[PDB]
Design a protein around this ligand. Structure first.
Ligand SMILES: Cc1[nH]nc2[nH]c(=O)cc([C@H]3CC[C@H](NC(=O)[C@@H]4CC4(F)F)CC3)c12
Length: 288
C-alpha cells in the first residue's frame, strides 16, 4: 500500500512561481497522477542549482513535518530525487497568498478589528513554535499566508532553527542575505537569535499589517528614509546606531495609540526586557 506523503516527480507539474530567494524557490504545482488536470494544487519548495543548502532543506522539512497548528501551514509531503540526494518540500496551496499580496487588494474587506485578529493568530503560531524550542528568524508579512479572510498562517520555515536546552539563543554563521530591517539589535550585532528576537520581528510584521503592506511605507523604505537611502555596505551599521539612539518606526496612520504601545514593547533594545507572545495575545484580546 502507498504512502500519501510521497509525491512522484513525474506527476508534479509546474503552473507558476509563488516566491524565491538567494538559494531556493517555491512554485505552484498540480500533483496530477491521473493526467487530466483534475489533481490537487500544492506549494512545492525546492533548491536552485549547493551541498550546504540540501542540509538546510532537509532540516526545514523535518521541522515543518512535526508542527501541527491552525496558524501554521500544513506539511503535505516530500518528493525525493531518483538517485537519492536531491529533494522537494510539498505544502498546502493557499490561493489568497501572502499578506504582502493580499492586503493591497482587500483593504475594503479588512479593518482594524480583523488586523488585530490576524495579529493574535500570528502570535499563537509563533508561541507554539517557541514552546517547541524553535527560533524562526524570518517573520515578515511576506511569510504570513491567508487561508481565508478570518484565518492567517505562518507559511515559511526557511531560516527556522532549534535553540538548545542549555543555551538561550542560536548563533548564525551564514547571515549573508538576512532581512535586516526586520531584525532585533542582537541579531544585527552579535548574530544571536533569541525567542525575544522573533517578538522584535513580529512588531515590524504588525507594522506592515497595519499599513496594508504598502511598499511606500514598508520597513525598508521608512528605515531608508530615516538613516539614508544610499550608504551601501554601511546601511546595517547605520541601522544599528539609530536603534541605539531610540529611533523606531512611526505609528501607522489610523493605528490607535494603544495598539502602537504593544508594537513599541516589541522593540525594546535588550531581549530580556521585551514583551512575550502570550502577553501580546492578552493585550490584543482586551482591545477586541
Ligand atoms: C507555502 C504556501 N502555501 N500556499 C501559498 N500561496 C502563496 O501564494 C505563497 C506561498 C509561499 C509563501 C512563502 C514564500 N517563501 C519564499 O519566497 C522563501 C524565499 C523562499 F525560500 F523561496 C514562498 C511562497 C504559499
Amino acid at each position: 500500500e502507498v504512502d500519501p506523503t510521497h509525491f512522484e516527480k513525474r506527476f508534479l507539474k509546474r503552473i507558476r512561481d509563488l516566491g524565491e530567494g538567494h538559494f531556493g524557490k517555491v512554485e505552484l504545482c498540480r500533483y496530477d497522477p491521473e493526467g487530466d488536470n483534475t489533481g490537487e494544487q500544492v506549494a512545492v519548495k525546492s533548491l536552485k542549482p549547493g551541498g550546504n543548502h540540501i542540509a538546510d532543506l532537509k532540516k526545514e522539512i523535518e521541522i515543518l513535518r512535526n508542527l501541527y497548528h491552525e496558524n501554521i501551514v500544513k506539511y503535505k509531503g516530500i518528493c525525493t530525487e531518483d538517485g537519492g540526494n536531491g529533494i522537494k518540500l510539498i505544502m498546502e496551496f493557499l490561493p489568497s497568498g501572502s499578506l504582502k499580496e493580499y492586503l493591497p487588494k482587500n483593504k475594503n474587506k479588512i479593518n482594524l478589528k480583523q488586523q488585530l485578529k490576524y495579529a493574535v493568530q500570528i502570535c499563537k503560531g509563533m508561541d507554539y513554535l517557541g514552546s517547541r524550542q524553535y527560533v524562526h528568524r524570518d517573520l515578515a508579512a511576506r511569510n504570513v499566508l491567508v487561508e481565508s479572510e478570518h484565518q492567517v498562517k505562518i507559511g515559511d520555515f526557511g531560516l527556522t532553527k532549534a535553540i538548545e536546552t542549555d543555551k538561550e539563543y542560536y548563533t548564525v554563521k551564514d547571515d549573508r542575505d538576512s532581512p535586516v530591517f526586520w531584525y532585533a539589535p542582537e541579531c544585527l550585532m552579535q548574530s544571536k537569535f533569541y525567542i525575544a528576537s522573533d517578538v522584535w520581528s513580529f512588531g515590524v510584521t504588525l507594522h506592515e499589517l497595519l499599513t496594508y503592506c504598502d511598499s511606500d511605507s514598508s520597513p525598508m523604505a521608512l528605515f531608508l528614509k530615516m538613516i539614508g537611502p544610499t550608504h551601501g555596505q554601511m546601511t546595517v551599521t547605520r541601522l544599528v546606531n539609530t536603534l541605539k539612539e531610540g529611533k523606531r518606526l512611526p505609528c501607522p496612520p489610523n493605528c490607535p495609540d494603544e495598539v502602537y504601545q504593544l508594537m513599541r514593547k516589541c522593540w525594546e533594545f535588550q531581549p530580556s526586557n521585551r514583551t512575550s507572545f502570550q502577553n501580546l495575545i492578552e493585550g490584543f484580546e482586551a482591545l477586541l
